[PDB]
Amino acid sequence: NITEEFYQSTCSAVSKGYLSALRTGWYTSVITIELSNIKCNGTDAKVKLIKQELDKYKNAVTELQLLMQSTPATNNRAFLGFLLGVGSAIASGVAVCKVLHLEGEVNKIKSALLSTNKAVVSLSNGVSVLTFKVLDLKNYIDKQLLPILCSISNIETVIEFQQKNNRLLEITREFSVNAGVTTPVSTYMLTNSELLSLINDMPITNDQKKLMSNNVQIVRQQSYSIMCIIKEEVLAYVVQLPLYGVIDTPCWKLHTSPLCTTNTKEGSNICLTRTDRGWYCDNAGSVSFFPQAETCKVQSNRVFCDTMNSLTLPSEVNLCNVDIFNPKYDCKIMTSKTDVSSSVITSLGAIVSCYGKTKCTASNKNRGIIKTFSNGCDYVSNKGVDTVSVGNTLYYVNKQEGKSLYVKGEPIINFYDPLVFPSDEIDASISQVNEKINQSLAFI
Amino acid sequence: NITEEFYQSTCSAVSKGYLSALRTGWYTSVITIELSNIKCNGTDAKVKLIKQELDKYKNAVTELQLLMQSTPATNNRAFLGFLLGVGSAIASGVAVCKVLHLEGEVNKIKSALLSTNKAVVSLSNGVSVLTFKVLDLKNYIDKQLLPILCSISNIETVIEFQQKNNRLLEITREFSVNAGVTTPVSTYMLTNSELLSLINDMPITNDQKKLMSNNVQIVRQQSYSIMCIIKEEVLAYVVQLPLYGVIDTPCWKLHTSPLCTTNTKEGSNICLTRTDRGWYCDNAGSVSFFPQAETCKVQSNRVFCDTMNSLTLPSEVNLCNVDIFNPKYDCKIMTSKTDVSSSVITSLGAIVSCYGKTKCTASNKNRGIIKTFSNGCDYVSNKGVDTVSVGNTLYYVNKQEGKSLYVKGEPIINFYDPLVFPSDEIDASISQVNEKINQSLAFI
Amino acid sequence: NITEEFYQSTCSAVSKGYLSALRTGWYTSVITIELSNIKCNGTDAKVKLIKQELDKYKNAVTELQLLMQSTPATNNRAFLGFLLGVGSAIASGVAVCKVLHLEGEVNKIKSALLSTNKAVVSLSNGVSVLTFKVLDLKNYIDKQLLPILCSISNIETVIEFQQKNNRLLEITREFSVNAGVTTPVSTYMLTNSELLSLINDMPITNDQKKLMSNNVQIVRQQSYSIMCIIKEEVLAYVVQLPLYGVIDTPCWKLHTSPLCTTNTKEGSNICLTRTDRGWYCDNAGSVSFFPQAETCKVQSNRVFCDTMNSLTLPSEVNLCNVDIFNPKYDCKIMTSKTDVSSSVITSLGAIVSCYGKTKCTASNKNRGIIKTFSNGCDYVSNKGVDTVSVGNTLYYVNKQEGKSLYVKGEPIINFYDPLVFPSDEIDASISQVNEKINQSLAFI
Ligand SMILES: *[C@@H]1O[C@H](CO)[C@@H](O)[C@H](O)[C@H]1NC(C)=O
Ligand SMILES: *[C@@H]1O[C@H](CO)[C@@H](O)[C@H](O)[C@H]1NC(C)=O
């Protein structure tokens, strides 16, 4: 299943054996709530609580109408994460909400949901969306609360109205503190049973349905709830769900740590770090590279990522793991003189970069220290090891089952003459450093 | 209204036509909740629920008193975002909460709100703050719950007490998971009707009132709720609201993308990227520049930003868009050899940086691909285009109405000799690169 | 108590007088909720609300069981913050949740909590954890709701069941929008009274107990709630609490701002910035350095940090404050030509970097401007000063009591010849710049 390989030559480790679940597109659906357009002298304590809860309903509608006085929009951005492009996440959902403001477009939705709660509607611009009516407050108020307008009430209707109205109030609270765009999509916007049935009635493959149904918590974190329109007794908000066009392709996570020399005199040390760490997944002949591995969510061996946070690299980028000096791909590195100690916890072990006077160890629960790292970059597997200490920092290692492979090799930092080594190169590569050394050497 | 101009020479696009709403200061207000200092043998099921809800009230007060055992403080920080300064956001509100601990200062507030819920109070240090009493639990408990202390109760008082007490419990929950400082300000801290009336009774211009009232959801996201003091049956917490001293000045958003050469042999390419992307707004003879455009919130054509996240640049910075080689301002760029493909979704179109073997296209809903980008930096408008693909990444473009202008020009990267081009310069400019090239040329 | 020293030579200020509270480890506890495995024809309005609330209970259990279809895991990352290592925060808690899936392990917990709500249990792998039963829904349903299965009910049982079931529903909502791992730990996962007693029954020093009890809001923000297992009528989720192995050691916060020359001709200026800003705390003969001071939480004079976000540096790093040219430690700086104006609000004052044509002032509430900064880097104390203005940005200063010391000195940027000054060095030091200048000088 999950395996790992550490490369002593480049101070890096690769965790193989994962499967992909990349979000490639969006599916926009319209969630609706039918409202009541409702306009005594009694002071009954049972009806006073009804008038109180009914005023919470009037204010919620007014608050949401005041909220839609403008076009919904989220804040847009317009190691190697700074190389990414800039997208507009809710651009697809906003385009669907723009259509619902066209005249007669809401009446098309209101009539389709007249005899059922769930319907597919083709909009005027051509988009085929799935529409869902999740709360019929119009039917409840006009059939139960209106016949009391008095003092013909009971305590059982006060409780039932507070329950039905509570969802509208909570949806309002979320939109009020999020400027009408929320993520992840809470259970008030879409309950678990509603989401599961929404996924089932969705035009996707059987493999996409089973994937989304077995990982609904991830689907929520990758969805947006966009407040849309209140018109003609209909409250509509667009839910924007992820499409996983890439499923079950190989994925692997590259971990990197600084590789420095271990000379005794302080300051005369040179360092080198592979900057291409992150998640990699095979995707359509290329490799989708996610520089900020903190953007992907891992469930057992499934990896959920968003292509918006990816670069599309040639598959030859994998050669940097075996031979960082290969002539087919220019492997990205950074150079530095900052030889500070740290550790990187991998999927099945821990990389340790111990330099200077730092105390680096690997311990077990009952027995204590079992390995003492010397100066340089080293690695230990989580088999038999429970914690790793670098300086004053205690790292817990991941206790997942898997086999690691230690690939011995000469650290490539030893191949560089420190006198002509180009320190302080942040976005560099093997060929750039060689081109810079060749200039410094010719100038001597 | 909204227009856009793409500059082929520098691979950048400017979106003009926006209006400003910059937060320049803070207005601190004091929100109060009057508490009851309350100290049978019956087992009535109606009174047992009252004793349960009353114990939730006692614990909430104790939890908030335990919360104020120290001075409230938020975590402080002390492309071009690293050039920003460091502020203390709640420093103004904390100074107001420090005054409320002075003796007799709380009694001044308690007496001002005796005959009304809303009052302006001048504190001892000279600050004139607006005080609001939003919940009188003291009056409810002492007039309704105290007369039952028994078993003279009904179910209608159990429900009404749970409703009034629920707000205090929720305010407590928020402060417990936020260390007494919350943002945005939820509807439990300040309801929509309370906030709107607070804005109305605020000493500001009529233009500031209408702006804040039409964008209350933004005012929440730019406000802080600071837990303050519990003393003498009074629960006080400071709400810190934004002041928009700059309103309706021109704003524009600068989008930049890497500009590289398109030579066939891999690695021999040089790249150049304008680093001055972000939001720009005219402000008091200068230009307020926001390097991280993700910090500003856009509502239709209004742009809400915080001057704390801005630099104050000369208005001559606008010359970099027309002539990046102008002698009046040193335009900021970065150099690199990393020619990776990406796209930047603009307000009215999309910039495409296609390099190497990447497949870059622009498509429509029904018809599919309509443009195939060649190697280099190019642009397409959202008119007729719905999606843009770079590699394995699908970008949805913004469907907002507006007119774009394509300004043809020679890409400035072609003006540089690659042999003496200074690659890997992150925080550089046009003059710095020229000064570095002149040194490499003189040394040959 | 709190003091501050500004160094005019290096444009930096140190705030001394704080005490440490560094998280060094984790303590995992198991929170349990006993569930009821429950399987009429009446339409009574009192029993219909019971069947409604009972179906919310069935769905909550089903939703949580569907949530555990995989191993819980959070998104992992694998000025000087980029030098930090990479940990797995919930690795310790996940290893405890992995043990609860072993057969018979849950039955050990179920029997220990049979006669009490609070117990210490030694697991099969050897870990001694504290187990807590916080909700016995099994006892409530089987003793009160089961005897009605009808129409023997009252309204007092509908309210009491909605109250007890509400906590399970809220715990479910949090786990649904967080993929089973939440932080901070809300009051639904662990109430304030439960947490305080959990801290009391914890195997730690008396000093750790009093510290955690007086700062429970911080303990929440540094804890994780990990959804674990639902097996044999037991709902278990692991709460992972911080261990503060370092307490009451000296801490100080280093603030830095750009130091530039003030020549009249634009562009001919060189800049220099100390990059070692952040929090420093004495820790076990070394110094724990936190490069991103926004990760530490300050309560009065106590500083709560996490060693996972720290580097372990020699105590000689403190010499950079008095003598940045000391031969014992290579002080980290960055070089630049970007002379932009900004301010840094310190604990007791404000650093001002005024360059070019920027208007930099320091004002008071009633009197207005009292100091006008000239070009260069300067400092003002919060005594008598309420606000600081740099350009169009208004900074409020911290009004905390304390004494500042202005240490006069020649700005070290004046010691460098601009013709051979190495601009655009991001991760550099004093010795690196000298080594680069010596090369440029020998080449002339
Ligand atoms: C200089 O370039 C040549 C050819 O590209 C290469 O073989 C040699 O190793 C380079 N020199 C250094 C010091 O990297
Ligand atoms: C060198 O500097 C001069 C004057 O500043 C300028 O005209 C020339 O273009 C520079 N050379 C290069 C290669 O940029």
Ligand SMILES: *[C@@H]1O[C@H](CO)[C@@H](O)[C@H](O)[C@H]1NC(C)=O
């Ligand atoms: C060159 O190095 C020597 C010895 O390390 C030092 O004394 C001198 O100041 C350096 N020169 C410059 C310009 O920094």
